[model samples]
Target chain A: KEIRIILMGTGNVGLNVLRIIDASNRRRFSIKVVGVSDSRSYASGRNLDISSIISNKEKTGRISDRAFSGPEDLMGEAADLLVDCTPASRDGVREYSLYRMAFESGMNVVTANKSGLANKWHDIMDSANQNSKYIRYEATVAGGVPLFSVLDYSILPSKVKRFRGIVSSTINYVIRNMANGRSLRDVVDDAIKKGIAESNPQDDLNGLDAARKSVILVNHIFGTEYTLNDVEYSGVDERSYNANDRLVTEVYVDDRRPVAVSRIISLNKDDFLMSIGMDGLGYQIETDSNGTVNVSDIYDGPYETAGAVVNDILLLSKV
Target chain B: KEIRIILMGTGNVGLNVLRIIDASNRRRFSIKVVGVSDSRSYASGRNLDISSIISNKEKTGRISDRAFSGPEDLMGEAADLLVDCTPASRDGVREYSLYRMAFESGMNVVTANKSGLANKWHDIMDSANQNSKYIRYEATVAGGVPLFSVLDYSILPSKVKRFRGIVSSTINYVIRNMANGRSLRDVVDDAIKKGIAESNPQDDLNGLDAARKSVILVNHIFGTEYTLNDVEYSGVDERSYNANDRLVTEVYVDDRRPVAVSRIISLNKDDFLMSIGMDGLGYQIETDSNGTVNVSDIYDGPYETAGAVVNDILLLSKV
Candidate 1:
C-alpha cells in the first residue's frame, strides 16, 4: 500500500526531509508525501514534487498561491503518517498537542522536535501507544548519531540500569575546542558567530538541551516514566561524580588522546558496556568529523539536524 | 495469541537458547517452545519446561526416554515459527535445506547458523520474501554486536557504497594479542584457554569465518548478490587491504584503555554512507568481552553465540 504522508512544519527539518524524499527511491519506500504545510503555506490534495518546492522556497520565501488556512486545516488532510519538522515547541502546549492530533487522526509520526518527547514524554508516548500509532524521534536526541538505535540493539533483550551521555552538539563542540585550548566564552561566541549555537546559547550551555535528550533517552530505552525533573542535569562544566546507587555515566573526554574518537559508552546492570559501538557489517562506512568517532559530523548545524530528521522519517516509515 | 515455536538443535547454541528461554520474561515475549530437537533427541506434542529438560540433559547427558524418532518428526509439529540453532552448516546441503523446508511449510526463521545464508543468501532471502517470511540472523555476524540491524537503520534511508568491519572475535583476538607482544601460538593458546577462540581455530584464523560474515554483511545490507566466493578472502594476518578508491576499515584497540572503543570512519559518493556511527542509547547496557580489550572472562565463549541466537529469536517473534 502506498502510505500517504502529511508533513507539518516546513522549516529546516521539513525542507531537508523533502530533500531526502526528493532523492530517495520512493518505489521501495512505498510512500508519497501528499501534503506539506508551514505556518503560512500549505500544499495538499496532490502529490507535490518536494524537490521543486524546496528549491522554490529557497529562491523565494513562499510556496505556491495555495496555502493551509491554519493548523485546524490539518484535520481535513487524509494522511497515514505525519512528518513533524516544526521547531522545538509551539506555545509548548500547542505544539505538544500537534502530535496527539496526528495520533488521534490515525497518523504515525516522524518528528525532529525534542519537546514533544522531552517535555511530555509519558503523555505523548502513552497516547500514541494506546492509539496503536508510532512516534519516531531519532533526530530529537542525538541529531545524527544512531544513539538510541544502537543502544536498543546492543543493550536490548536486557534492561539498562544506569546511563550517562554527552548528547549536545553545542557542548561536544565546546569541549572539543576546549581540548584544543579554546576558552569556554570564546568557544561560545565563535559557535554563535558560526551559527551553530542558538541565539540564546543559555539553554544549550546550561544543560537544558542535554537534559532534554537525556530524559528522552531514559524514557525510550528504559521505559521509564521519568519527567525532566528526574534528570538533575548540570552544564558541560566538569561534572562532579557518579551518584550513589543510581547508575549513570558522565562524559569527561579531555584527559584523552585525539587518535581515536569513540561514539558512545553504554552500560547495563549486568556490566555489559559497549564503547562507541560501530554496529555495521563489512563496510564500516564512516563520514564527516565524528565520522572519525561515533555517529558524528564536523558540525551539528541546520542541515545536519534536517538530515537526522529525514533519517528518522525513513526509520519510522519502515514500521 | 502466544507465538508457537519449533526449536531445532540441542548443541551449545540450542542449549543456551533453552537457558535464555528458561529465564526470559515469557509473559512479555509470550512464546511457547512447543517443539525441541537435536541431532539425536526430540521432544514435542506439548509446551516443554526448558529448564528441567536442560537439567536432565546436564545430568543424564541426553533428553528423556520419550523422544521422537527422526528429523521427519518436525514436519508434524505444528509451529508458528522455527528457531534454527544448528551449527554453521549441515553436510553443506542438508542444514541449508532445513531452513528451506521450514520456509516451504510456512514458517519464518530466526537462526544462529550462518551456512543457510552464507551458502545461499540470495535464494533463501528471495524465497523468504516471496513467501512473506523473515529469516533473522542477528547472531550470524558479530554475535554480540547488532551489526546488520544498525547498518540497516543507518543506511536504509541512505545508500551504502562501501563498508569495512573487524567482525570476527577469533581474528580480533589474534591481532590485538599480537599487538600486545604475545606470540601467535601463545595468543591462540590463551584464546582457547579463555574460551574466546574456537576449539577448531582453523576456520577463524584462515579468515573463512570472517569472510563468511563479511559477505553476509555486504549481501544483506546492499542487497547485492554476493556469495562467499565474491569476497576476496584473507586472514587476520593482515594482507591485501583495499587502501584507495575503495572503502575499508581495520579495528585496532590499544592494549590499555578499557574506557574508549573507536567508532566507524565512513565516506562515499554523496548518496552512500552513514559515518562513525555510535549506536548507543541510555542504560548503556554493556555485557561482554572480546577478550582483546575489557576484563574478559573465560565464559564469554559459546554462550555468547547462543545468547545472540536467542536474541534474534525474540526479535523475529516480535515481528
Candidate 2:
C-alpha cells in the first residue's frame, strides 16, 4: 500500500520532485520519500528529513550529512524504487552501470537522467528482466510527458510503426522567443532564470539535450541498443536558426497556441528515422470520463518535470 | 494472467475493436473475447468465436447463432469488463442505466458511448465507486489523441489550473475538407467515407458531439457533475458554416489542413468556456521539452479511436 522512494540527485528536476512531494505528492500518490541522496550525501529513514537535504545544500554549500559507500552500494537496499535524476556524462557508462546495479538488487527505477538509457539500455533492460523490476524514465525526454508509458501503457505495443514529436521544449522556447523578436542571448538568459534551459546553454541549444532525448525514445520504443551517438540529430544551432524565415513562414498562429514536434517514423525491421526539425507535438493523453482514470495533459514548467517524475513514481503501484 | 472481455455492440467502433483483437489485440494487450453482443443478438461462452461473430454477422445479417438474456443480465457473469461501443441516445438514460447494471453487479465497464458519461456521469461514477470497479472510455472523445489519461497519468494530480485542446477530430476533419473549398455536403461525405465523422451528421456537425466531449472533460478534469447541457457550445453549424468566409480566413492553409478547436477552459467552481475553430489538424498532444507540456499534433484514421480504446483497456494492468 505504501511504496517507498530512494531519490538520487538534488538538482533542478530532483529538487522539484522533493518540493512537489512535500506539497501534495505523498498524500495523493501514496508514496513516501523514504530515502534521498545526492553525490556527496544521503538522508533516509522514517521521515527522510529531505528538508535538511535541501537546507544543508543551500546553507553549507555541501550536503556534508551522511556519506555511505558509493551509490552503487545503496542500490535498492533502502526502498522499492531508485529514482536517478543526476546527470551522467562520459557516455553515461558510470551512471548506467550504477543504476543497473539497482535493477539487479530487486528494485525498480524511475529516472530523469538520460545517460544510463542513452548508453546501456539493453543491459539495463536485461537486468530489469532478470530481477523482474521496471526501469521507467518518463522524465528522460520531455520530463513529464510520460512519453515512455505513452508507448508502453497507452499505445498498444507494436502498433506504433512510426512515431515522432516536437520532443524538445527547450528549442521551442528559444524559437518561440525568437518569433516574439527576442535576441538569442536575451532569450537564453531568460530561459536560464526560469530553469527552462540548462545552465550550459550548449546542452540545450547545441543539440545535445535534444539528441540524447532522441536516443532515449529509440531505445525505449524500438528496444534498440542505441546511444546518443546512434541518434543522429540536426535540428538547430545559433547560425542556422536565424538563417532563413523558414520557421516563421511555417507556423501560422491562431487564438490557441500549438506545441512543437520531434518524430520517429518507423521504417522496416524495427528501425525508425528520427528527426527534430518538425514543429508539432506527440501522442497526448486525457481522461475517458467513464472512470476515475484520467489522462495526462501537455505540461510546461520546471515543476511539471518534477511533478511528472513523481507521478511516475506513483505508477509503481501497478508494477 | 488473463483478462476477460464481454464486448457490447457491433458498430464501427465495436467491430473494429473485435477485428483488432482477433488480429492480435489479445496477444499484445493480453485480453480475451469471452462474450459478445449486438442489437440483434448475443453470443456467450469461453472461446467466443469472435471471428465467426463478425463472419456470422456478415452472412446472416445478425449475430443470431445463440441469443439469450439481454446484455444487462450477462454483465460480469460472462466477463469482468463490458466494453460498450454502442451508441445510446436521448440523454442515454436507457444505455446509461444499462451499463450501471454492470457496475452494480460486480463488474467493470469500458465505453466509447458518449451519451452515458456526458449525461449521467455522476451516477455512473458513483456506481463504479460503490461496486469498486473501473470504467474507462478514452474513445468517447478525441479517440486517438488520448486527452483524458494525458491529464491523469502525466500532469501532476490537481496541478492543471487551465487546460484546453482541439478535442474534436470530426469537426477538424470537416473543417479541413471545407478549408479545401469543398461544399459542406462533400466534406461530410468524405469524413463519413473515411470513418472520421459519425454517420449521423447532425451528431457531429450540430456541435453536440463536441459539447459532449467537453462535458466528459469537465466531469473528468474538474471532478464536477456536468451533462451535455452544462457547457454551451458556439462553433459553426449548417447555417453559420455555409455563411462563414470567416473560417476560411481564420485558417490560413499550411501544405493542406485545418485544426478544430473544442477547448474547455475551466472557470472557478465547475464551469468553462467552449469554442471551435484550426491548421495542419486538431487534437494535438505534447511534451515539456520547452518551458512546459503542450499538446501533440494531428492524427487520423484507425489508430486514433479504436487504438486509444484498447489503450484504455490496457490500463487494466494499472487498475
Candidate 3:
C-alpha cells in the first residue's frame, strides 16, 4: 500500500515527522511525502526527497521557491492524509477550516494540534463523520503516552468513571520549580526560552491548556459534548507552594451532571501525583472494571509528538 | 453485528470476561456467549445466560452438567471467536493444538494464555496468517497496561531498540516481601493461597514465567524468533535483603546478537524501577525516534486481564 501524505507546518514536530517517515523501515506499506508547507512556502509533488526538503527548509527557512499560498492550494494535491503539526491557536479558526477542507477533499487527517478540535469539536468531527473519513489526534492530549489508544481499544466494554491527570508540562515545570523556591516568572521565562512552554505562557499559567486537554479527554472517552466553557478550572498563580503541591486536572463522568475541573493540589509525599517529577504528565483513571490505573511519563520533546503523528498516519493509512 | 464466542476457561479471569461482556452497554455490537467449558464440563447453546452459568459454576465447580470430552468438542460450535483463558502450561501442547483448531474453524482468538504462543510461536502465527485471522493476546504480557497495542499502533515507525521491564506479579510480590524480612517459602505459600501466584509456583520462582513473557515481548515487538532456550535467566532464590532491590527482565534488540535476561538487581533509591510498588509491572523502551518511554502500573486483579480480553474481543469483532 502507498500512503501519500500532505504535511502542514514546518516547525520542529513537523520536521521530525518528515525525518521519521523518511527513515522508517516499515516493510508492509510504503509512504510518500506528496506535499509539504511552511508558514511562508508550500511544495507539492508526486514524491519529494525528504532529506533535500529538510535541507532546503533549514537553509532558507522555507520549503520551496514557489510563491507562498495557503492551505487552499494544498487541497488540490492528491493525497490520502493531511498531517497538521501547525502551532496551536487559542481560537483554532484557521486550522478548523483547513481540517474541514481536507475532509471535503477526500483525505483523512492526523494532527498534533489540539486547539482546532478543542474549539470546534462538532464541526470537525461531524465533517469527518459525514465524509466517512478518519481523524486521529493522539498527540493532542498526552504527547506520546498513547492514552487515547488504550482507552479506545485496550479497555473497551469497561467505561471510565473518573479521570485525574497532570496534563501540562509547562505548568508542571513551573509548579515544581516554584515549590523549590524559584520565582514563577523566572521558571516560566526559562521554559519559554527552552521551547518547552507555550509562546504565550498565560495559557499554561491560567490553566487553559489543561482545561482544553480535559475537554478533549471527556469528549473522546465519554463521547460527551463538552466545550471549554463546561470546565470550571483555576490555574497556579501563587508565587510560593507547599513542599508537596502538585497541579492536576480532573473530570467526573456522570451522565446526569458531568464535572471537569483543574486546580492546584497539595498532595502527600507518597501520593502518585507527587511522584510525577519535573515536567512529567501523569494520569489516574477510575474505571468500571479495572479499578484505578495510573499512567505517567516525562516529556522528552517534539520527537514523541512527531512519533505520535506518524503512528496515526500509519494506522489511518492501513485502515 | 452479533458476535458468537466460545469461552475455554471457567476460572476467575474467564468469569470476569463473561460478566463484563454480559453487562456491557455497547451499542455498536452485541456479543453472545455460545459455548463455555471448564476443565470437566462443557455447555453449548445459541446464547447462554451469564448469571446461570456463574451460579452453576459456583455451586458445582463446573460450568455445565454435561461432561467435557475435550477441546475438540468445543470447536464444533458455531462461533466467531475463541477466548482462551485456560491456565498456562510449560509445554503448551494442548493449548497449541486447541489454538490451531480454532484458527482452522474460521474463528479469531483472544487469549490470556501465554504458554501456547511462547512455546509455538511460528506455528501459531503461521496458522493465523494463513487463515487470515487475528490472534490478540494483550493480557499475556503486562496484565492490563496495553503494551502490545501501544507498541503496534501508537508508536509506529519508531522502532524499539531496547526493552527493560518487570513483568511477573508473583515474582514481584515474593521478592518485595522477601526483602522485608520474610521467608521465601511463606511468601510463596501466601501468594498461592491468594491465587495471585501460579498453582505451581515454580514458574514464578525460577524465572520461567518472566522468560516466557520476555519471549512473547521480543517476538511481538522485534519480530524475532526467540524461544525459552534463548533467554539466560536467574530467579530470586537467595533469601536476601536490600532496601532498593528490584527484579527486572531486559531484552536487547540487536539483530546481530539479541539478548534476553532476567534477574534481581540492587538499585538506587530514586531509580524508576525502585518506584514500582508491590506487584507493579514497569517497562522502559528505548526507541530510535522517541528517546525512552517508560510505562508502569500496579496489578489490581484478574479484572485487568479480563478487561484486556474483552478489549481484544471487541476489536476483533469490529474487524
Candidate 4:
C-alpha cells in the first residue's frame, strides 16, 4: 500500500524532509508525495518529483506557479497524510484551522508546528479523535529527541509523577555561559551571533517557548488541561547562581493539581540534569513504576528535526 | 477489536503484566488473556479471570492442572500474541523453540527473554518477517529505560556511530561501592543480600548479561550481524581504580567494522555516563544526524519490566 502525502510549508525543515524521503530506502515506506506547498504558492499533483520539487524551490524560491489564498485552498488536493512543517504561529489560528480542515477531509496529520499543539492541543486532538485520524508531532517539543513517543508508547501505564527537563536550547546556552563567570549580555550576544539564540530572544528569555513545551509535555504525560496561561514560568535573567545550579522546566503535582514552571534551581554535582552540555536538552522523569528515567540529546539543527518528522511518517505508514 | 494473548512464564513479571492490564484503563486497549503458563503447568481458556489467576498461582504456585511436556502443547490454544515473560535460559533452546512455534502458528510475540534475541536474532527475526508477524522486546534490554524503542522509532534514519552504556547493575553496584573505599567482598555480599545481585552473580559479574545486551543493541542500532561470541568482555575484578572511573559496555565502528567490548574506563566527572547512579543504566549514543543522545534510568524490578512488556502489547494492539 502506498501513502499519498501532502507537505505543508517549504522552509529548511520542509525541504530537508523532501531530501530525506528521496534518499531513504523506499521499500519499507512506500510514500508518494502528492502535493507540495509554500506559504506563498502551492503545487498539487498525483506524484510530485521530490528532486524536481527541491530544485524548483531552490531555483524559484517557491513550490510552483499555483497561488493559494490560504490553507483552505490547500485542502482541495487529496492526500492520505498532511505533513505540517510550518513555523509556529503566535495565535495558532491558521494552523489550527488547517488541522481541523485536514481532519474533516479524512487525512491524518504529522506536524512539527509547536503552537498548533501547545495552544490547541485539546481542540486539535479532539478533532482528530472524533474524525478517527492520527496526529503525531515528535518534533514539536524536543528537536530530535523522542520525548513524546517514549512517554506515549514505552512508558505508558506507568504514571509520570515528576517531569523535569531542559527543553530550550537558547536558555541553556545563555545560562551555561553565565554560570561560567561570563557576563549575561556578552553570553546573550554570543548566542545570537552563533545563531543559537534568535536576534530578538524575548520568547526564549521570557520562558514562553519553554513554557509552551512544558504545557505540551504535561498535557501529554499527565493528561492535565494545561494551556500557556496555566504555566508559572521564569526565564534566565541577570541573576547570579552557583556553578552547581541549573535551570529546568518542571511539571509536578502540587496540592493535588499539576504545576508547570521553568525556574533556576540548585542541584547536587552528580545530578542528571547538571550533565547536560550547552546546545543540549535533558529530561529526568520520575514514574510510579519505572523509577527515575533520564534522557538527553544535543539539539542539532533542521536535519535532525526533519529526521524526527520522517520517523513519524514512517510510523503512520505502518498503520 | 479485542486482542487475545497468551502469557508464558507466570513469574513475578508475568503476574505484574496481568495486574497492570486489569487495573489499566481498558477502553484504550481491549485485551483478553486467553492462555497462561508457568514452568510446571499450563492453562488454556478464553478471557481467563486475572484475579483468579493470581489467587490460583499464590495458592498452588502453578497455573493449571493440564501439564504438558513443553511449549508445543501451549501452541494448540489460539492466541494473537505470545507474551514471553520467561527468564533468559542458558542456551535459549526452549524459549527460541517456543518463539519459532508461535510464529508458525500465526502469533506475534513480545518477549522479555534476552538469550533468544542475543543468540537467535536472525532466526527469530527471519521467521517473524517470513510470517509477517511482529516481535517487540523493550523489556529485554533496559528494564524500563526505553532503549530499543528510542532507537527503533525515535532515532531512526540517524545512524548510530558510537554507543556506550553502563548496562549491568551488579557491576555498577560493585564498582561504585568499591570506589567509595569498600572491600569488593563486602560490596558483593551486600548486593546479594539486598537482592540487587543474584546469589550466583556470575552472569552479571562476568559481564555475560552486559555483553548480550551490547550484542542486541549493536545488532539493532548498527544493523550489524553480531552474536555473543563476537563480544570481547571483562568482569569486575579485584583491580583498583579511582572514583572518577566507570565501567561501560561499548560498541563502536573500529576501522570500518563494529567492535563490542566491556571494560573499566575513566571519564570526566561531568560526562553523561558518569552521572549514572549505582543501580541505574545509562547510554550515551552518538548519531550521525542527532549528535550525542544520553538515556539513563534506575533499573527497578520485575514490575517495571512487566510495564515495558505491557507497553509493547499496547503498541501492537493499535495495529
List, for all models, the DockQ compared with the true complex: 0.16, 0.21, 0.61, 0.60
TM-score of 4: 0.88
Q: Candidate 1 on A179-222: residue-level lDDT in tens?
A: 56678889888766644564347766666666666667656654
- Arrange candidates, best TM-score first: 3, 4, 2, 1
lDDT of the structure predicted as candidate 1: 0.57
lDDT tens digits, residues A1-319, model 4? Answer: 6777888887767888888788764435567787778878887777678888889999989888888677766666678899998777787777788888888999999997778778888888889989999998887776766677778666766778998887776777777777789887898777666444432478777777788788888787778767888887778766786776666889889999888888877877667777777667778888866667888876545667778788888778876
CA displacement after TM-score superposition, residue B154 of candidate 4 (Å): 1.2
Task: Please tell me which predicted candidate would have the highest DockQ against the true structure.
Answer: 3
Q: Tell me the spans in candidate 4 whose CA falls farther than 4 Å from its real position.
A: A25-69, A72-76, A181-200, A241-246, B25-31, B34-38, B41-44, B47-69, B72-76, B181-186, B189-200
Which scores better on DockQ, 3 or 4?
A: 3
User: Relative to the true interface, what fraction of contacts does candidate 2 keep?
Assistant: 0.23
> Where does candidate 3 clash, by residue pair?
none
On residues B79-144, what C-alpha lDDT tens digit does candidate 4 reach at each position? 899999876777667777878888889999999878888888888888898888989888877676
Candidate 1 off by > 4 Å: A25-30, A63-70, A126-132, A150-156, A183-200, A236-308, A315-319, B60-70, B126-132, B153-155, B183-186, B193-195, B236-301
RMSD score of candidate 1 (Å): 9.7
Best by TM-score: 3
Docking quality tier of model 4: medium
Model 3 residue B236 CA deviation (Å) reads 3.1
Q: Comparing to the true complex, what docking class would candidate 2 get? A: incorrect
lDDT of each: 0.57, 0.60, 0.79, 0.78
* lDDT per residue (tens digit) for residues A1-319 in model 3: 6899999997778988888887883434778988899888888888678889989988988888876678886766699999998877878788789888999999999988878887888888988999999898887876766677667665677778888877777877787888788887799777776456654678888878788888888788777778888877778874578777666888885567777778888887666666665755667777886556676666646777787788888888778
Over all chains combined, what TM-score does candidate 3 have? 0.94
